Symmetry: D2
Subunit: 254 residues, 4 copies
C-alpha cells in the first residue's frame, strides 16, 4: 500500500514517501507498476539524490532500457534541452516503448509544464458506434525514416484496457481519403485531448514522472521563453501492439 | 422500352420520344417510374405544350400531389422565382416527399443550372466500417417550426437500396457533441457531393425534371444574377423512412 | 506596493502571497492587485478561509461595482450582453479531493501571437454572441486600461458576421484554437479557501468536469464592465 | 472580330461557334480567341473533327509557345514549378458515352467574391506547391493581361507558409472552398472533336472519374507561362 495522491479526476497520481533508487524491493517496484497501470502517469517529488547512473539503474527495475545520442557516462539516458505537440513516444516503430521515466534537472521558474492524456479513458467515453468504428481502424505512423501500421485501438497487454493510438506521428488512417482521414482523426484525437482526460504537471528540480506510453499521449508546453529547462529520460522497451481482433502492428517502410 | 440516354456516369438520364400529359398509359408511366428509381433523376426536353393544370395532372399519374401558397388555378403547384444549398426536399418532416416534378417556365440565357447527387451511390462507395457506422446514426432535421429524427441511412421502399439522408436541414447527429457531429456530417455529406456522384442540368424553357427524393439531394446554382428564372414544381407525398434495423423516423417537435 | 507575486504559467496566471483579502484593504493594495490582474489575467490567493459571503462581497466592492447575473466549455462570462462583466472573483467553499480544476486562457497573448495578416483580419471581424439576447461584438477588443488587443470569442459565439456558416466555422476554429493552445493557458487545482480573480476582458475559462459526484461548491461575485471598443473605435451593440 | 460566343455558365465558360481551328487562322481571329479566353476563362469549340495531332500543335503555336510537361482532383496545371503553363488546349479523341466530364473553376471570380478583409488576408499569403520540385507562389496572382487577381491554390498546395498545419488547413479550406463553390464552375460533357482551351492563370479543373472502363482519350498541348506576380509585386520562386 503506497501513499498515492491522485492529481486530476481521470489520470495522474503523486506517490509520496518513496525514494527512487536502483535498490528498491520487488514489492515497492510491483506497487509502482500497478499505480502506473491504474493512473497512467505517476509523479515523485524531491528525488534530488537521483543522478544519471542512478536513474538508469532505477529504470532497470521496471523494464529493459532502450536507446531512442546519449548522455555521457550512461548507456540509455536521453537529454531534452521542444515537444509541444501531442504524441505517444516513438509510435513510428513497431514495438514502441512501454514507459518513460523523466527527471527534471533544471526547471523554469515559470512555465515548462508537461501534460498527459489518458487514451484509455478517451476510448471508453466514445459512443458505442464510434468505439466499434475505432476498433476497425488502422493508422500509418511515420517519422517523416520509418513507416509503421498500427491499429487505432490497442488492447493493453497487462490491463486488457483498450486505448486509442493516435498522436503527432500519424500520417493517415489507412483506407480513407485525405479529407476523411483528417475528420476521423480530428474526432478521435479530440477526445484524447479533451481537458477532462488530461493532467498537467508543474516541474520542480528533482521531480520524476513515469508514464504508461501504451495508454497516454503527452505534450510539453513551450511557454517558458529562454528560461533554461533540462530534463533527462530513460525509455523502456515495449511490445508489438495487439488490436481488438488480435492483429499485430507491422513496420512497412525502413 | 423507353429511349433513355444517361447524362452522367452514376446518375441522371434524359428520356426522349415522350410527351408528358395527364393521359399517359400505365406502361409508359411504369417505365418512367422504373427509369426514375434506376437513374435517380430523369429529364424530358421540349415539353412546351405542358401547362399548370397539365403538369399537375401528369403528376397525379406518379403519386399523390401534396401542398409543400400555390400557383392560381392549381391545388398543388409551387413556383420558385434561391436554393443554392445541398438538400433533400422537406426532410424536416416525417414523411417527406418521394419525388418532385419540376418544369422550367423561364430559363436564364446563361447560368441557372440545377445539380443532383445520388445518395445511394454515396452510401455504397463508403468503406465498410464507415457504412456500418452510418447504419447506426440518426440525425435531427429542422426547418429552424418542425424537428424530425431520421436515420442517416434509409432503405429505399422500392429498390431496397440504402441511401444517405443528410443535407441542409440536418441540425445535428444525435448522440454526439457539436464538434463530432460536424466532422461526421462533413465526411458523409462530402461523399454525397463528390463530383462523381452528381449530374448538372442546364435548363431550357419546357424542360421537365423528375427526381427520386428518397435517394438524392439537389442544389440550384445561383450564378445568373438578375436574369429571370421561373420554375414550377409539383411534389408527391412520400412514406415514413425505414432505417437499416427497421426503425422509423419520428417528428419530435411541432 | 510591491506585492509578493509568483507567476504560475509562462504566459498567464500568478499567485499573490502575504495578503488576506477583506473589505478593509487600503487603496495601495487594491491598486497593486488591479495591476497584477491586468498584467497576469488571472490571479490566485490561497488560505482565504476567514472569508465569507458578506466579506467576499465587500472585498469585491473595492475592485468595481458588483452586478447580478458544470461550465466545461471555453467561454468569456456573459458575452451575449453588451457590457459584460470586467472581472469575476471566485472562492472555493468545497473542493473535490481529485479533479475540479479550472483553466484560464489569455486572449491578449492569443491575439499577439497571430501572424500579422491574421491579426489584421481579426481586427476587422465582428461576431454574434447569444445565450440561445443577441449581441454583436468585435472579435478584437481594445482593453480600456492597458490598450491591449484581445480576442473576444468562446462558447457564446453563434457566428462571425458577414460569412457563410462554413467560413465562419473555419475562421472561428483558427482564432479560438489560438486562444486555447496550451501555451496560453493556466490550470488551477483548487483547495478550500482559494480565491481567483480574472480579467474577463482578456480571458476565457473552462471548469473541468472530471470529479464525478464529489461535492464542489464555489461562490462568485461578478463586477460590471464597459461596452467593448474595437480597433476602429466602433462599439458593441445588442441587436435582439 | 466579333465572334459567335455563347456563355455556358453564369460566371465562367463560353462556346465559340463558326470557327474551325487550324494552324492558318488570321491574327484577328486569334486575337478575338485570346480575348474570349481571358474573359470567360475556358472556351469550347465543337465539331473540330478535321483536327489531328500535327494540326492541334500548329494551332497551339498561334496562341503561345508549346512546352513539354485520371485527374479527379481540383488543380491548376503544374503549379509546382515557377513559370507554370498559361493555358492548355485539350481535344477529345475518344469520348465515353456516359460520364467523363471535366469541370473548371474561375479563381478570379472566387477571389472577387471574398469579403474585403478576407481578400486582404489572401493578398498576403504565400503557399508551397509540390509534386511530392517545391515552389513558393503567392496565394493571389495578378493576371499579366487583365490585371485581375486570382487565387492560386489546388491539389499541388502542400501548406500555407508561416502557419501551423492546422491553421494552414483551415485557411486553405476557406479559400479553396470559394474556388470550387458550384457558382464559380462550369462542367463540360465531351463529344469526339470537342476542343477546350483554358486560362491556367485563372482557373482550376477536375476530370470526373465516373466512366468506369469506357475508353477515354484526350490530347493536350500546353503553352508556356510567366512567373506569377503577387499583389505587392513579389515573384514566385522555386526553392527545392
Ligand atoms: C515535437 C514532437 C516530438 C516529440 C519528441 C521529443 C523530442 C518525443 O520523441 S519520441 O521519443 O520519438 O517520441
Ligand atoms: C435554401 C434551401 C431551401 C430549398 C427549398 C427551395 C425553396 C426547397 O424547399 S423544400 O421543399 O422544403 O425542401
Ligand atoms: C457551459 C458554460 C456556461 C457557463 C455558465 C454556467 C452554467 C456561467 O457563465 S456566464 O453565463 O457567462 O456567466
Ligand atoms: C490527380 C491530378 C493530377 C493531374 C495530372 C494527371 C496525372 C496532370 O496535371 S499537371 O501535372 O499539373 O499537368
Ligand atoms: O519535455 C517533456 O516534458 C516531455 C518531452 C517528451 O515528449 C518525452 O520525453 O517523451
Ligand atoms: O430551383 C431548382 O432548380 C430546384 C429548387 C428546389 O430545391 C426544389 O424545387 O426542390
Ligand atoms: O466553476 C468554475 O470553476 C468556473 C465556473 C464559471 O464559468 C464562472 O464562475 O464564471
Ligand atoms: O482529362 C481531363 O479532362 C483534364 C486532365 C487534366 O487535368 C489536363 O489535361 O490538364
Ligand atoms: Fe514524448
Ligand atoms: Fe429542393
Ligand atoms: Fe464562467
Ligand atoms: Fe490538368
Amino acid at each position: 500500500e503506497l501513499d498515492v495522491h491522485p492529481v486530476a479526476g481521470r489520470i495522474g497520481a503523486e506517490i509520496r514517501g518513496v525514494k527512487l533508487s536502483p535498490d528498491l524491493d520487488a514489492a515497492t517496484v510491483e506497487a509502482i507498476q500497478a499505480a502506473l497501470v491504474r493512473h497512467k502517469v505517476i509523479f515523485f517529488r524531491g528525488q534530488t539524490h537521483l543522478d544519471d547512473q542512478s536513474q538508469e539503474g532505477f529504470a532497470k527495475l521496471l523494464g529493459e532500457p532502450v536507446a531512442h545520442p546519449v548522455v555521457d557516462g550512461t548507456r540509455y539516458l536521453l537529454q531534452l534541452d521542444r515537444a509541444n505537440s501531442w504524441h505517444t513516444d516513438v509510435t513510428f516503430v513497431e514495438a514502441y516503448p512501454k514507459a518513460s521515466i523523466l527527471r527534471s534537472v533544471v526547471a523554469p521558474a515559470s512555465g515548462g509544464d508537461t501534460v498527459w492524456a489518458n487514451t484509455a479513458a478517451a476510448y471508453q467515453e466514445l459512443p458505442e458506434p464510434l468505439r466499434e468504428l475505432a476498433d476497425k481502424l488502422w493508422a500509418v505512423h511515420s517519422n517523416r525514416v520509418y513507416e509503421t501500421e498500427h491499429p487505432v485501438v490497442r488492447v493493453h497487454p497487462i490491463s486488457g484496457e483498450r486505448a486509442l493510438q493516435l498522436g503527432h506521428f500519424v500520417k493517415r488512417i489507412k483506407g480513407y481519403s485525405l479529407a476523411d482521414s483528417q475528420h476521423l482523426f480530428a474526432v478521435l484525437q479530440g477526445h484524447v485531448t479533451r481537458l477532462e482526460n488530461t493532467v498537467r504537471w508543474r516541474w520542480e528540480a528533482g521531480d520524476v514522472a513515469i508514464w504508461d506510453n501504451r495508454a497516454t499521449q503527452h505534450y510539453a508546453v513551450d511557454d517558458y521563453g529562454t528560461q533554461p529547462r533540462i530534463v533527462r529520460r530513460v525509455t523502456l522497451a515495449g511490445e508489438v501492439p495487439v488490436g481488438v481482433d488480435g492483429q499485430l502492428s507491422r513496420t512497412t517502410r525502413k
